[PDB]
Amino acid sequence: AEATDPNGYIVFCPCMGRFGNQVDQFLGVLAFAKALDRTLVLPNFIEFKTKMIPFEFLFQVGTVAKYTRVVTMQEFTKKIMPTVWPPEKRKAFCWTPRQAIAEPGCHSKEGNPFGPYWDQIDVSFVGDEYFGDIPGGFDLNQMGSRKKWLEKFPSEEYPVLAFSSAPAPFPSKGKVWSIQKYLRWSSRITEQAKKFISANLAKPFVAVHLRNDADWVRVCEHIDTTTNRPLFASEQCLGEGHHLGTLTKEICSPSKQQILEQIVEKVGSIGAKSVFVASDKDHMIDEINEALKPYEIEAHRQEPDDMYTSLAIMGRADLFVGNCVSTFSHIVKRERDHAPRPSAFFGI
Amino acid sequence: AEATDPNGYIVFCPCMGRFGNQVDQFLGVLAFAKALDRTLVLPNFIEFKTKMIPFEFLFQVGTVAKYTRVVTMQEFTKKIMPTVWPPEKRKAFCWTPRQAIAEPGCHSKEGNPFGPYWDQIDVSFVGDEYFGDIPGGFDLNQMGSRKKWLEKFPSEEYPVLAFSSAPAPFPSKGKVWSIQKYLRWSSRITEQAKKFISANLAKPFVAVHLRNDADWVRVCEHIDTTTNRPLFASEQCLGEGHHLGTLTKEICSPSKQQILEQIVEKVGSIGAKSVFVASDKDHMIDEINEALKPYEIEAHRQEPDDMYTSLAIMGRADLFVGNCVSTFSHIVKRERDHAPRPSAFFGI
DSSP states (O other), rough: OOOOOTTOOEEEEOOSHHHHHHHHHHHHHHHHHHHHTTOOOOOOOEOOOOOOEEEEHBBBBHTTTSSEEEEOOHHIIIIIIIOOHHHHHHHEEESSBOOOOSSSOOTSSSSSTTHHHHHHOOOOOOEEEOOOOOOOOTTTOOOOOOHHHHHHSSSTTOEEEESSSSHHHSSSOGGGGGGGOOBOOOHHHHHHHHHHHHHHHHHHEEEEOOOOOOHHHHHHOOOOOTOOOOOTHHHHOOOGHHHHHHHHOOSOOOOOHHHHHHHHHHHHHHHHHHEEEEESOOOOOOHHHHHSSSOOOOOEOEEEEEEEEHHHHHHHOOOEETTOOEEEEEEEHHHHOOOOHHHHEEOO | OOOTTTEEEEEOOOOOSHHHHHHHHHHHHHHHHHTTOOOOOOOEEOOOOEEEEEEEHHBBHHHHHHTEEEEEEHIIIIIIIHHHHGGGGOOOOSSSOOOOOOOSSSOOOOSHHHHHHHTTOOOOOOOOOOOOTTTTTTTTOOOTTTHHHHHHSSSTHHHHHHHHOOOSSSOOOGGGGGGGGGBBBBBBHHHHHHHHHHOOOOSEEEEEEEESHHHHHHHHHOOOOOTTTOOOTTTHHGGGGGOOOOOHHHHHHHOHHHHHHHHHHHHHHTSSSHHHHHESOOOOHHHHHHHHHGOOOOOOOSSSSHHHHHHHHHHHHHEEEETTTTTHHHHHHHHHOOOOOEETTTOO
């Protein structure tokens, strides 16, 4: 006999993008759950090898609970689902019906990682509900929107709002960035971060995020400086709606020369004794070491490059230099601001 | 030098479902274009063999123009696109960014028939815009929604609103059904309809729509009579929100016996001299002929079964017996009501 939340629950797939995008929307989902006053089922994060990673393996449940009411996916499946969310009542929630690429619907389980995510917790949907007629959908930005959610999907009939995709803005709104202070790395991640730092990174150290795979270069070469709209996390350095300047290809994709000059500069600025590099592809260790040869310091990376432990290391750095467009860099910026530790971005 | 509409244009893919669903949303799109006061680019309809069928091959442009301002796809590509919609300005419009199954976006051209549709008219998108923050999206149902469309997407910057999917409710709202009176079959279709009738269908004739492929049977066996919500076109026989009765599996998927009894009954009722059958699969010609043997009349079908000419034939029938759940049957019902000719449905 489990006593469940009378207001009910939200559960969702963090089904868009890599970890950067997933954390970016997760901040919004926390706000949305708080605003609706429903318990948030903490997601399994998704990694592409498909691997589901429990929230609690990465971040501390105790800490996130200081923002809003939460349960782990483990608690939800074992303790909550059996008494309030039987298989006959499992409905998925999306904006509008869509054509499968099956009747018109959300297609919550079509493709990867959509299907694997829900299959991980033995969930099949027996119907869809739509929220497009609630003004702003999940924004809660508009008058009567919050109440329409309560009106349209009452907890008795709808104890679980299960979302096909994260019910949150992408990219995240400035108002949710500070929620990052409630994402505290797990003990395992923090131990690993500390071990690496003591083993390889003489203090003070500069940590850098480099983004340079072909997919990334393609997005950067599309930038329109005349319209100058946000791209991914670009507002982190340029302000809301870019009121501070123009997003350039130099900012999105700094050249090897631009990277090396700016690293040498930042090392000089703080009298750094080591450099840490995290990258999606080219860590430029050999080129950076060649550049820092006169300072008698070296650059170090993780092998293999553990995404989560690298974020934690960058969070602990004496100085962080990130890529302004990258949501992965945005995790670091927000942690350093709120979890203020000095940060900088390439080309700004 | 073409003088174009200062208010601009709407173009869309009828990217959901077979022709029934496509016409169902098209009625809504006509209303939406009318409400926004933008010229509607008439779609190419989609058939799965992927084949694009020009609007004007099926329906009369003159007739639809009596509802709202329209141009054919041919006019749009040759006369309009070159002066107001250059490749650099071709943006797609959807509710929210989504994950491709590519950066987050509408993915207007991912899969089939999405990609082939836009490739048919040589359109590639260079960016996405979202409309989820306009209350109700394309509903225009809500106060300030119409004006937010005008405010957010002005014709100067946005001369073409190009939609990834039809910007219309599915299933269609009762308020749009009467718009079907502005869909008048082309001369080619009507000639073919008449030829078949004179050749095979002694008057008066009963026309029947039969739906029975495996995919269909699967949807019908999911019906919940206790919640009794609309399914596809079911409101055509049961009223808005089913205020008239309960949608049953008998209505959705009538048995062979139920079909045969009800056909014999309807033939009796009007002293019918022939039967016409249109089906997605089993036309039951041999079983129906066995049943009508005592009336000395026969059932006839088209070979191969031309979807469009069959709808036109059913529209002209002395009595139509349709499937209440089917949007294909709903085309017939609405034509007979508005284009009132007698209609009936199996199991009601």
